[PDB]
Amino acid sequence: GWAYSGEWGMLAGFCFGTLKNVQEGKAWFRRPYIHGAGMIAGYYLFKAAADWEDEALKRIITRYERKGYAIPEDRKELFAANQYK
Amino acid sequence: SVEERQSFHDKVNDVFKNLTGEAGKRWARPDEPILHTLNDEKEEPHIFFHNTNYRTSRKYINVEKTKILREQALE
Amino acid sequence: AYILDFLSYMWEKNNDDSASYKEWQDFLDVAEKDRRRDRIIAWRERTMYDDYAANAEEPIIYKR
Amino acid sequence: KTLWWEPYWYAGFGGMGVGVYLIYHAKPLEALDIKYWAAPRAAKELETEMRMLDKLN
Amino acid sequence: MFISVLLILFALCVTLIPEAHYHMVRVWSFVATIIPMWVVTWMWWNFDASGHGLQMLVILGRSHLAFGIDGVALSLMLLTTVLFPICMMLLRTVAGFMTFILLEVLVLSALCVLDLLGFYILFEASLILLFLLIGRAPYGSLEAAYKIVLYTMAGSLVLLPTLFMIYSECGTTNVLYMTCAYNHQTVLGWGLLAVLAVKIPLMPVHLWLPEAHVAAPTAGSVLLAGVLLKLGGIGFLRFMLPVVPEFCVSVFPLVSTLCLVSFLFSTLSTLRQIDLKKIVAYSSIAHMSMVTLAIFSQSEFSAYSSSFLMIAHGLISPALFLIVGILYDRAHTKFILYFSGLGASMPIGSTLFFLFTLGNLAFPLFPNFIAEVLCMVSIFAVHELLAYVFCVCQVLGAAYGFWAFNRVVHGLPRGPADVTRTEFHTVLPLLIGAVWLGIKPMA
Amino acid sequence: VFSGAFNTPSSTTAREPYAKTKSSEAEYGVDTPVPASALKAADKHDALAYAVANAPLIGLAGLAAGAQEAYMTFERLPPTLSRQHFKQAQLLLGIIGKKTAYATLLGAVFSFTDATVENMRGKHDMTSGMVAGAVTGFLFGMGRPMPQPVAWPLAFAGAAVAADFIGELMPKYMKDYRIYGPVVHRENWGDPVPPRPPILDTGAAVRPSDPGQFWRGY
Amino acid sequence: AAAAAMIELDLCFGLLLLILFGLLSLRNGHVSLAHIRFICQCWLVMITPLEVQDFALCILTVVLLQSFHSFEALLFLLLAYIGQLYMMHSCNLVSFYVCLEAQTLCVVVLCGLLARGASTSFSVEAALKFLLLSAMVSGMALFWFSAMYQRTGSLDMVGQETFWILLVMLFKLGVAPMHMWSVDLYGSIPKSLLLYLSTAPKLSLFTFWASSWHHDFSVGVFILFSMFIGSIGAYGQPALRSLFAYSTINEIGLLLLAVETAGFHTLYQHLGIYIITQLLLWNLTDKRLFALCAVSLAGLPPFAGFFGKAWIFWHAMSVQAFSLLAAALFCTLLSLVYYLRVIRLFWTAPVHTAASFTGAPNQTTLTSACAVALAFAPVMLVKPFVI
Ligand SMILES: CCCCCCCCCCCCCCCCCC(=O)O[C@@H](COC(=O)CCCCCCCCCCCCCCC)COP(=O)(O)OCC[N+](C)(C)C
């Protein structure tokens, strides 16, 4: 999957904490433990999404080859790869 | 046929992959075009961009020729 | 006027024409791999999951 | 009294103007404009074409 | 790319500054637009003019969003990075600073994208920002905001299925492979014409501009006139001409008659206008019609002359909007009948108004003169009469320009006092750019 | 690629027409059959039979609008009027029948004028639809104040023009469109050949216009 | 051997224990039941199989249970979840009928039970109308199932009678012109049941459609009716509940365009983005985020609603469904006007958010702030993800 998905998840967690503060009338830096928990959850959620990227590509190539669609070996590496793009 | 077109495309991709040039030469100011018998040169993108660079070079050189001759004729 | 000559030398030293060519080739290669992957994926059949003829090759186990 | 934007305005637009000047007056000529790359290559081709046109006459 | 992320993150830190520190908020938001001007000037330094057509490339995997620099994009990016700090000098709230910062991110990334879906995503993500900017509650106009948003949405919705049609046809929306594949050019050509004939004001889909460019604030008018219209021209030059050229030949009589009637009818309408901002707003339609016909001529050096006219318009018309904005800010009206004798009461402002009036009418020693000459060289090389139509109608542009100037500048002196230091320095970079690009533009 | 001097794709063209692209190992279409009523309804050689085949469908629209208006009128009836069942039935059936007959008349006029101009000009093009739309819209717009005797022919002709462009001309132009397999006229790029066109279980409004676009069914 | 059915025995044993625990807790006079809700969520997790759609429904219902407070409402939602889960596994019209009828009865009873204040009789009225309209659709389903059973002699869902079963399914999704029961429900019933009604049953029924349904017909006229009626109705209705009811009819028309052209991947992507937006919409306390729902339901580019609409448009253009696509694009142009009305109402206004007094301080800021981060999901949406 994508190489920078965990950093994107951490930025998502920071924005999550800032919005939870803004909704309840607090300044952006208040309750930094909420930011930290949000960062951890965002990191692991977007890493799981990046794992599903590779899983979906593997499922597509496996189903297509079992149906009779013969893919050349120069193009099978586009699918059967845990590519860290 | 389709097989011959495919093998030619593979050869062109291999050549343009392993290409280098140094010592005062700019790539994308090539000395010669790539001569081909292709129907629609845009079938092979590397050849299309190479001949595009060569054609750009020729247009600018012809403009410069016009300027040199205009100075001579004025003299 | 010597500053101009030294800045010209700095431009020539920093520019690397072979690195420009490798940048161009990597751009073309990444785009071509995306296009190839997307073209293979677009052979996208769609029936219901219980279609045992359209999905005849899947290794499915049923509990009924 | 100096207005709030004046140091930043003069730094930003002056450093853009000096930079545009240095682009025009300190870049290599082939890097500044392709017409400097093609001016010497047109001259030799014209030298070997003027005598061709002389012989054709 | 790393630099662009740093510039975005530095720009977005304006929100976190506490509002009670007024000086810091002003300085931070002004510097946040000064820095990209330096970076784009450095990109011009780094450019090899004898090298490849596309330089400084970056592609972000399988997410579309691929970027590269050519000459047209580089000149337009330089113009945008000049224009945005002047907009920062004309705003007073953090909401305005943030709207213009987000607009600068979207414009700069849209100008140099090489993916059609990326262009679609990046450009019309600015629609809601334009709606809020134009329909601001006490002094805007919600009717104008509705018009500009609905026209742009209509064009974009025509394009979107044709974009996806070529994407299913060849497998990519990257312009380097879209130009080398076989595609059904009539459908995609109609979709691209639909977006870019609304972005460039081409009749009949042009009625949003007179409302929006007048109802906007002065900073919004500077942005909308000097920048956002040229996204249609760079759309023509980057996406439509390389990918659907057979369509671009076959539609030439239709695009030609649209350009001719837009030029003539918009020039005729400009003469009956009674609002100074509406006078400045209409005059932009005829210039963009000349730009579009010069792009579509494809004849001598058409990309060069059309880009140079886009730059000359983007320098001259924001300055006219700035002078009208000064008059409106310190007299609370934009109506011609309330202004007379502005030469005696604002001599510096009237001198600047006269110089930019002469520039807008394509007089020599301004970049518009060189631009219109080269655009008419490109038009003349297809046929002489298509050039003659623009040549003989020059009295009609000068009529409205000199009539507006003579009505507001001469006569009985009534009206506000002369410009301040801040107003003069909002005007000043455009004047220096005009003098340079009209006297020694090239070396 | 991008220069201010010229646009290279504007002059880099094929010198010969291409051969047909092979898209799959099986090149026969699979689809459900069309009902015979619609097969007969496509025939234009008999103008009267064309109008008879097509007009009841256009009358169905007036039936739906008339049934709507009849129910909305029935709901507002006071009890002193609603209990008189013969009068109620003749009022509601009058509303429905007038709407149905007007729709059937407009449809028959359109279909007959279309096939008449078709057979008179000897060819199939967009002129017959525009003339039939002008005639039908002028029939609708008669007797009304004056934007309308021009506005309604324009609307019916525009409906005919949109029908031609969206339903007929664009499918004909894109008969060789492929979303799968080799790129058409770019077989050297090497995209693999599947054993068959893709099987899609689409609805009856989405049917393949060419045998190679997809296989429809389940 | 019954060893392959321990999850069913676990379902029944858990219900038997949960009723007794709820009885014991109420004999103590407990005015709150968070322990009962946690046991209900545990039971939801413990009975759900390991498929993507099953766990999507499970996690959705776990999140939904935080807006319900009485024991009976929790029991009705669990027994509606049993129908929603087992409809996705139904391969006949017997189980199809029973699951649909269990869901209808649970929804009717919840609409009666949870109303309060001056809006009690309006909610009961709309529940009665929904029950009467649902009874005749259930009768149509039974009648045409009996016809199919007599003709074929088996339980296969083939032949001409599947057209009426398809019309039954279109009624359950609120497809225009059979849409007015949902329009009646939106105007009176409270926000928590409106949140429940717009997410879970659509997922359950579309998964049954994806899993075990084929018909030889079309749904194009109902696509046209839903899109045009929903867009024009939401343009014309000044009450916000009716605005969102008609915009829901428009969205179900888009989902039907995704179904009609095959390609269920775009259907699933748009449905997921819509469900997350619904979870944000009905739990909002700060009204500035009402504008984010507006820009992400109008299909505006950088937000996730654009991506959900745009794969539907891409797959429709791929198989050349031109007329339905053109109608969809026109209705998308119309939808922007009333989403801009939403933005005018709730973004260009002074901000007022009342504090809590009796505890529970802004109790669903976690979920609403988590669902607002649909501006970060587009990085994963552009890839080949949902297939
Ligand atoms: C399509 C070509 C691009 C031309 C667009 C028109 C530009 C407007 C002004 C004309 C200036 C001409 C400058 C010529 C020399 C500069 C360098 C150069 O060569 O130009 C660059 C690009 O030039 C620029 O970017 C010019 C920047 C002009 C923008 C100026 C407006 C912004 C300034 C505003 C005012 C600032 C005042 C501040 C002071 C207070 C590349 O263009 P080509 O030579 O055509 O590229 C060669 C093609 N190939 C690689 C394939 C061989």
Side-chain angles (χ1 to χ4, degrees):
Chain A
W2 192 33
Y4 304 104
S5 66
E7 288 84 1
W8 195 250
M10 283 180 186
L11 177 69
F14 175 75
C15 284
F16 150 79
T18 301
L19 187 74
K20 188 168 169 49
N21 284 344
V22 167
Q23 272 194 272
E24 301 183 3
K26 303 173 171 70
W28 67 270
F29 47 82
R30 304 295 314 236
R31 310 181 276 167
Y33 61 84
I34 289 177
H35 293 90
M39 279 175 179
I40 283 150
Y43 174 85
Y44 284 114
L45 274 171
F46 276 84
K47 269 194 86 76
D51 279 294
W52 171 252
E53 281 186 273
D54 305 321
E55 178 60 43
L57 283 181
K58 178 172 140 89
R59 279 181 188 188
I60 287 170
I61 184 68
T62 306
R63 292 184 316 182
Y64 282 17
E65 281 207 305
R66 288 176 300 194
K67 282 195 279 193
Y69 191 15
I71 312 295
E73 294 167 352
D74 62 88
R75 277 142 196 269
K76 272 190 283 189
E77 300 298 321
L78 303 166
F79 294 89
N82 194 342
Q83 198 187 14
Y84 203 62
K85 46 176 179 80
Chain B
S1 72
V2 54
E3 306 290 317
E4 305 293 319
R5 283 177 68 191
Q6 270 162 357
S7 66
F8 182 76
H9 184 67
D10 282 355
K11 287 191 305 270
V12 171
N13 267 11
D14 176 44
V15 166
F16 269 88
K17 186 174 181 89
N18 313 314
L19 193 55
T20 177
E22 291 90 3
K25 191 266 292 179
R26 287 182 177 87
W27 76 276
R29 297 268 83 81
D31 283 307
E32 294 292 295
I34 289 163
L35 309 173
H36 59 95
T37 50
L38 295 154
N39 188 37
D40 206 344
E41 188 190 90
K42 301 191 289 198
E43 177 179 358
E44 303 284 341
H46 292 302
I47 301 175
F48 181 56
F49 297 136
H50 187 106
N51 291 359
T52 297
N53 292 323
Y54 181 72
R55 224 190 302 181
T56 315
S57 297
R58 292 309 316 169
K59 197 99 188 165
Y60 277 110
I61 283 166
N62 290 353
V63 168
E64 291 321 297
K65 274 196 207 170
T66 291
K67 270 181 274 195
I68 297 169
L69 274 174
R70 212 199 329 272
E71 299 307 313
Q72 291 189 13
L74 278 161
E75 290 278 332
Chain C
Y2 61 91
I3 308 158
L4 306 184
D5 298 334
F6 184 72
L7 289 177
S8 168
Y9 171 68
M10 273 316 287
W11 195 95
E12 285 292 328
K13 190 180 80 179
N14 212 307
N15 184 252
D16 184 20
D17 196 70
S18 310
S20 287
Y21 180 67
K22 190 192 298 299
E23 180 181 276
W24 168 257
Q25 289 304 118
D26 278 353
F27 191 94
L28 293 189
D29 180 45
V30 170
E32 168 68 19
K33 284 189 170 186
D34 300 313
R35 174 210 84 77
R36 283 169 176 180
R37 192 182 307 111
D38 283 7
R39 189 65 183 189
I40 289 164
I41 290 171
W43 190 70
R44 197 192 322 246
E45 291 182 349
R46 190 32 194 71
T47 54
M48 71 189 176
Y49 302 145
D50 279 353
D51 199 331
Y52 57 93
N55 308 286
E57 291 100 5
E58 306 279 314
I60 305 301
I61 285 296
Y62 297 97
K63 260 152 80 184
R64 180 75 198 278
Chain D
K1 186 163 305 171
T2 294
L3 301 183
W4 69 270
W5 50 266
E6 276 181 86
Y8 308 99
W9 187 95
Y10 275 93
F13 282 111
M16 185 186 178
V18 166
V20 165
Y21 187 86
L22 292 178
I23 280 163
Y24 272 80
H25 297 257
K27 199 188 282 195
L29 293 180
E30 274 185 357
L32 169 64
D33 210 322
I34 191 167
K35 82 175 161 202
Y36 294 111
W37 173 91
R41 312 178 155 76
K44 45 173 184 181
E45 290 181 354
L46 208 67
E47 282 175 358
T48 186
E49 275 152 354
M50 285 293 111
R51 63 162 203 258
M52 283 176 77
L53 288 183
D54 286 316
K55 186 182 285 290
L56 196 80
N57 288 324
Chain E
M1 161 66 47
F2 188 71
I3 296 173
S4 77
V5 172
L6 282 184
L7 267 61
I8 285 154
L9 275 168
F10 175 76
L12 286 196
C13 282
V14 176
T15 47
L16 311 175
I17 308 177
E19 298 257 25
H21 306 135
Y22 308 107
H23 172 96
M24 177 166 168
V25 163
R26 300 298 311 218
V27 166
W28 201 295
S29 54
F30 191 66
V31 162
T33 71
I34 280 179
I35 295 157
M37 183 166 73
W38 284 352
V39 179
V40 172
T41 307
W42 179 84
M43 288 177 77
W44 190 12
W45 169 264
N46 211 38
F47 193 77
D48 184 17
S50 293
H52 198 47
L54 279 174
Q55 281 164 44
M56 293 177 259
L57 313 165
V58 58
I59 183 176
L60 282 72
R62 52 195 82 157
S63 83
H64 315 279
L65 291 195
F67 303 91
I69 308 300
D70 74 320
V72 193
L74 189 61
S75 51
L76 281 188
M77 279 159 67
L78 202 66
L79 175 64
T80 57
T81 57
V82 173
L83 282 182
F84 264 102
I86 304 177
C87 295
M88 275 306 167
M89 289 173 77
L90 303 151
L91 297 161
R92 84 196 285 277
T93 51
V94 164
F97 305 147
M98 288 300 304
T99 50
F100 272 74
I101 279 168
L102 292 164
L103 277 154
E104 178 158 37
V105 167
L106 289 171
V107 171
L108 279 185
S109 51
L111 275 173
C112 76
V113 66
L114 286 167
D115 200 285
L116 184 50
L117 181 49
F119 188 75
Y120 191 87
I121 287 163
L122 287 174
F123 177 76
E124 65 153 5
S126 64
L127 197 66
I128 180 59
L129 300 165
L130 289 177
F131 173 76
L132 294 165
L133 171 61
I134 290 163
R136 62 211 199 280
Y139 287 117
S141 166
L142 280 166
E143 302 95 309
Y146 271 126
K147 271 189 187 174
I148 177 178
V149 159
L150 277 156
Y151 270 88
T152 313
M153 193 79 188
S156 313
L157 280 180
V158 179
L159 169 66
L160 193 55
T162 70
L163 192 151
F164 280 125
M165 178 219 80
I166 188 170
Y167 180 45
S168 292
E169 184 148 18
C170 79
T172 186
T173 54
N174 196 79
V175 75
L176 294 177
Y177 288 91
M178 277 196 312
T179 187
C180 293
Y182 159 70
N183 69 82
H184 290 271
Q185 298 195 15
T186 316
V187 184
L188 181 68
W190 269 115
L192 291 158
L193 195 47
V195 291
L196 306 165
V198 180
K199 304 209 208 298
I200 289 174
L202 267 188
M203 294 186 183
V205 292
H206 78 294
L207 278 299
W208 60 269
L209 187 143
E211 265 86 8
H213 285 209
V214 172
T218 305
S221 294
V222 169
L223 175 59
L224 280 157
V227 168
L228 289 192
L229 309 167
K230 282 96 196 187
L231 269 296
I234 206 170
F236 286 144
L237 285 164
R238 187 161 279 224
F239 286 102
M240 201 178 71
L241 280 187
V243 175
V244 288
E246 312 173 334
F247 183 82
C248 285
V249 164
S250 286
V251 67
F252 179 75
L254 174 64
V255 169
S256 198
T257 181
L258 282 189
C259 288
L260 290 172
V261 303
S262 298
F263 165 75
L264 183 72
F265 291 167
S266 67
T267 316
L268 283 181
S269 292
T270 314
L271 199 47
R272 310 299 309 254
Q273 296 303 299
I274 53 174
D275 201 301
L276 274 165
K277 207 170 181 191
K278 278 173 184 162
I279 283 172
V280 177
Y282 288 185
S283 57
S284 168
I285 297 166
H287 295 304
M288 290 322 288
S289 64
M290 184 182 262
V291 160
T292 310
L293 195 42
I295 285 166
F296 264 78
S297 75
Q298 316 194 45
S299 82
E300 282 283 322
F301 264 72
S302 82
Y304 204 109
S305 43
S306 69
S307 316
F308 188 78
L309 189 41
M310 288 198 265
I311 292 294
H313 184 258
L315 282 186
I316 293 297
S317 64
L320 291 173
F321 272 132
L322 280 173
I323 296 169
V324 169
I326 287 154
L327 276 182
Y328 173 64
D329 183 68
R330 282 204 277 111
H332 201 70
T333 187
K334 301 176 288 206
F335 296 165
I336 285 179
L337 291 196
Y338 284 123
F339 291 113
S340 166
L342 279 172
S345 81
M346 319 176 64
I348 295 167
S350 308
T351 298
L352 291 157
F353 192 34
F354 183 57
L355 293 182
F356 284 112
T357 291
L358 283 180
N360 190 53
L361 298 179
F363 276 71
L365 311 181
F366 296 93
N368 293 112
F369 177 76
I370 292 163
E372 64 88 19
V373 161
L374 296 172
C375 279
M376 289 191 322
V377 170
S378 306
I379 285 154
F380 188 93
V382 180
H383 206 275
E384 305 98 296
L385 296 177
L386 302 177
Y388 180 76
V389 172
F390 286 98
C391 280
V392 71
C393 286
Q394 282 176 6
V395 57
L396 298 173
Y400 69 75
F402 274 84
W403 198 24
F405 180 79
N406 282 311
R407 271 182 298 182
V408 308
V409 165
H410 306 123
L412 188 152
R414 54 163 78 98
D418 213 357
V419 295
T420 65
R421 200 172 285 264
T422 317
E423 293 158 7
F424 192 84
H425 282 75
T426 53
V427 174
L428 200 56
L430 310 180
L431 178 60
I432 297 169
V435 165
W436 161 52
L437 289 175
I439 293 180
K440 292 287 283 198
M442 57 192 50
Chain F
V1 172
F2 283 122
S3 73
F6 44 83
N7 191 73
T8 43
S10 309
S11 72
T12 304
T13 73
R15 65 154 182 276
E16 294 166 2
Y18 283 97
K20 187 166 165 64
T21 293
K22 183 176 181 179
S23 291
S24 47
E25 289 303 310
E27 303 264 24
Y28 53 94
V30 175
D31 208 347
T32 61
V34 188
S37 184
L39 280 189
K40 200 170 174 67
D43 209 339
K44 256 192 193 191
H45 84 279
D46 202 337
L48 204 64
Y50 181 76
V52 168
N54 271 295
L57 182 79
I58 305 181
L60 203 43
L63 175 58
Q68 174 187 359
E69 183 182 359
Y71 187 72
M72 293 205 314
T73 313
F74 158 73
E75 267 203 353
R76 312 297 181 98
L77 282 183
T80 175
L81 270 69
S82 70
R83 78 182 87 169
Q84 309 175 41
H85 298 131
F86 183 81
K87 300 289 284 193
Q88 167 195 173
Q90 78 171 358
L91 175 66
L92 301 192
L93 282 182
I95 289 173
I96 285 175
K98 284 171 186 179
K99 282 273 166 87
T100 306
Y102 198 40
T104 313
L105 165 73
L106 290 164
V109 160
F110 186 82
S111 307
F112 193 72
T113 305
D114 192 24
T116 299
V117 177
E118 178 66 26
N119 289 337
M120 189 162 294
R121 292 181 93 241
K123 64 174 78 72
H124 172 53
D125 70 313
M126 301 201 324
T127 300
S128 57
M130 295 166 96
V131 169
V135 167
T136 309
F138 186 73
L139 180 54
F140 186 86
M142 267 196 300
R144 307 183 177 277
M146 191 75 204
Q148 304 196 53
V150 168
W152 289 108
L154 271 188
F156 270 85
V161 161
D164 280 335
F165 270 125
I166 292 162
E168 166 170 332
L169 283 178
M170 200 185 303
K172 173 164 69 73
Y173 172 64
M174 307 183 39
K175 275 189 190 302
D176 58 316
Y177 193 72
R178 293 298 188 275
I179 59 155
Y180 69 103
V183 177
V184 181
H185 312 331
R186 295 297 183 268
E187 295 102 310
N188 61 296
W189 287 6
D191 301 298
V193 169
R196 63 169 170 265
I199 299 164
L200 293 166
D201 193 6
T202 67
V206 184
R207 282 188 316 124
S209 278
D210 186 74
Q213 282 176 354
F214 60 95
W215 278 8
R216 173 178 185 275
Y218 69 108
Chain G
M6 290 312 180
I7 184 166
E8 274 78 36
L9 200 56
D10 198 78
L11 188 148
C12 299
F13 284 170
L15 285 161
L16 287 176
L17 293 179
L18 171 65
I19 288 155
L20 260 52
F21 194 59
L23 169 62
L24 292 173
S25 179
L26 287 175
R27 295 289 293 160
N28 285 76
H30 295 153
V31 306
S32 295
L33 300 179
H35 49 286
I36 313 290
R37 192 210 328 272
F38 176 71
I39 281 160
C40 285
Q41 288 156 339
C42 277
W43 180 87
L44 287 182
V45 165
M46 279 302 167
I47 67 164
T48 307
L50 284 158
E51 206 55 48
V52 186
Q53 294 112 319
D54 285 335
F55 264 121
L57 184 67
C58 177
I59 295 310
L60 172 64
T61 52
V62 170
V63 171
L64 292 180
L65 281 193
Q66 296 282 152
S67 65
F68 295 94
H69 304 294
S70 66
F71 177 75
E72 291 95 35
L74 291 173
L75 198 59
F76 302 144
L77 288 154
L78 294 200
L79 300 157
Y81 176 83
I82 287 174
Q84 282 179 352
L85 188 152
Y86 274 83
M87 194 165 65
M88 319 158 78
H89 301 263
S90 73
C91 56
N92 292 131
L93 287 179
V94 177
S95 44
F96 175 80
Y97 167 74
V98 181
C99 291
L100 269 190
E101 283 315 290
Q103 290 168 240
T104 297
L105 196 60
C106 280
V107 161
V108 165
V109 163
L110 282 158
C111 285
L113 163 74
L114 299 177
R116 89 162 76 186
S119 76
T120 304
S121 57
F122 297 93
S123 181
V124 173
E125 186 191 302
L128 277 168
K129 300 194 224 176
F130 169 64
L131 185 57
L132 293 169
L133 293 161
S134 290
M136 63 87 71
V137 174
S138 171
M140 289 275 177
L142 286 174
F143 186 73
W144 288 107
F145 174 38
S146 73
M148 216 188 312
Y149 178 46
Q150 200 176 73
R151 187 183 52 81
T152 77
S154 60
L155 285 177
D156 272 0
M157 311 187 264
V158 289
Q160 185 85 18
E161 298 93 339
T162 61
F163 176 75
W164 280 274
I165 309 299
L166 162 73
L167 294 172
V168 176
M169 292 166 82
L170 297 185
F171 175 78
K172 300 296 185 162
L173 303 163
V175 172
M178 318 190 260
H179 63 282
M180 281 304 300
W181 63 268
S182 186
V183 191
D184 282 330
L185 289 190
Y186 268 59
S188 55
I189 294 89
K191 290 202 308 174
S192 80
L193 286 173
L194 284 193
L195 170 64
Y196 167 72
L197 271 165
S198 44
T199 56
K202 300 198 219 308
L203 178 57
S204 189
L205 194 59
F206 273 133
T207 44
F208 163 74
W209 202 325
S211 161
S212 193
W213 184 249
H214 168 79
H215 64 94
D216 268 22
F217 306 97
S218 174
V219 290
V221 68
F222 297 107
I223 291 166
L224 290 185
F225 265 116
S226 283
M227 291 190 314
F228 278 117
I229 277 174
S231 279
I232 286 154
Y235 177 72
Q237 292 269 4
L240 292 182
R241 297 277 198 105
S242 46
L243 188 147
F244 282 113
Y246 282 112
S247 79
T248 305
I249 302 154
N250 188 22
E251 294 318 303
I252 207 75
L254 281 174
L255 295 176
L256 276 191
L257 173 61
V259 161
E260 162 82 357
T261 67
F264 272 53
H265 61 296
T266 74
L267 173 78
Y268 275 125
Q269 189 178 316
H270 190 231
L271 181 53
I273 294 154
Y274 182 74
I275 282 169
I276 287 175
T277 313
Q278 290 318 286
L279 274 162
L280 169 58
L281 178 67
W282 301 110
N283 292 309
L284 269 179
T285 50
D286 197 307
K287 305 294 171 61
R288 293 180 284 212
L289 306 174
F290 208 77
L292 179 89
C293 316
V295 305
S296 182
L297 278 169
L300 284 186
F303 307 96
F306 163 74
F307 299 97
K309 272 176 175 170
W311 286 269
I312 288 179
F313 289 163
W314 177 35
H315 188 79
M317 194 67 166
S318 291
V319 296
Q320 305 185 237
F322 294 131
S323 292
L324 304 175
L325 186 47
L329 293 161
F330 267 98
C331 292
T332 301
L333 176 65
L334 185 48
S335 312
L336 178 72
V337 184
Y338 54 77
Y339 285 129
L340 284 172
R341 165 159 83 236
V342 172
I343 279 156
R344 275 180 58 190
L345 274 174
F346 284 109
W347 179 264
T348 45
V351 169
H352 174 78
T353 309
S356 80
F357 319 118
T358 177
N362 217 353
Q363 77 197 352
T364 312
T365 44
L366 183 64
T367 306
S368 68
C370 174
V372 160
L374 61 83
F376 287 83
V379 176
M380 280 312 164
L381 293 175
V382 286
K383 326 286 203 277
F385 194 84
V386 185
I387 187 167

